[PDB]
């Protein structure tokens, strides 16, 4: 189970895939090359 981009993330290890826990907020993972 992994969240995708836009979505609460309980993981930063990009939760999903390619992306990242947004630690800055909104906290929902956002695309790791726009992080």
Same mark, same amino acid.
């Given at each position: 189970?992994?969240?995708?981009? #836009? /979505? /609460?993330?309980?993981?930063?290890?990009?939760?999903?895939?390619? #992306?990242?826990?947004?630690?800055?907020?909104?906290?929902?993972?956002?695309?790791?090359?726009?992080?």
């Amino acid at each position: 189970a992994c969240r995708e981009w #836009l /979505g /609460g993330c309980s993981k930063d290890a990009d939760c999903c895939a390619h #992306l990242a826990c947004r630690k800055k907020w909104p906290y929902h993972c956002v695309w790791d090359w726009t992080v």
